[PDB]
């Protein structure tokens, strides 16, 4: 599951947690750090 795979997964996971957009960006920021760390 490559960079693009993880971004799509990130989108759908965050879009489901967040009900405000600034929550979305934060979860998305976190998903980028998980990606870089991995």
């Amino acid at each position: 599951c490559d960079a693009t795979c993880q971004f799509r997964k990130a989108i759908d996971d965050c879009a489901r947690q967040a009900y405000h957009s600034s929550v979305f960006k934060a979860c998305m920021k976190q998903k980028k750090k998980e990606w870089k760390a991995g």
């Binding site: 693009t4 971004f7 990130a10 989108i11 759908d12 879009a15 489901r16 980028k32």
Partner: protein, 85 residues
Amino acid sequence: AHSDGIFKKEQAMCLEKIQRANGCPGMWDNITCWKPAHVGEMVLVSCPELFRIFNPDQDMGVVSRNCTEDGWSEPFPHYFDACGF
């Protein structure tokens, strides 16, 4: 937001026009529909349309791929670096 369903609608929507268009094949990477391309040309796309609604005030995101003898290249930049935050 029901993003996974919107993406899926778009994935079916995608296969619909790849077949009309058809160098590199028309492709769906699970984020963007890539209109098939000749070797040596560069296709730009913008960030997924969802983001027009998620962060309205940001619209400079571009992602590129080259069509080479060896098929499509990686995204450049990666979707995380061009469409994440």
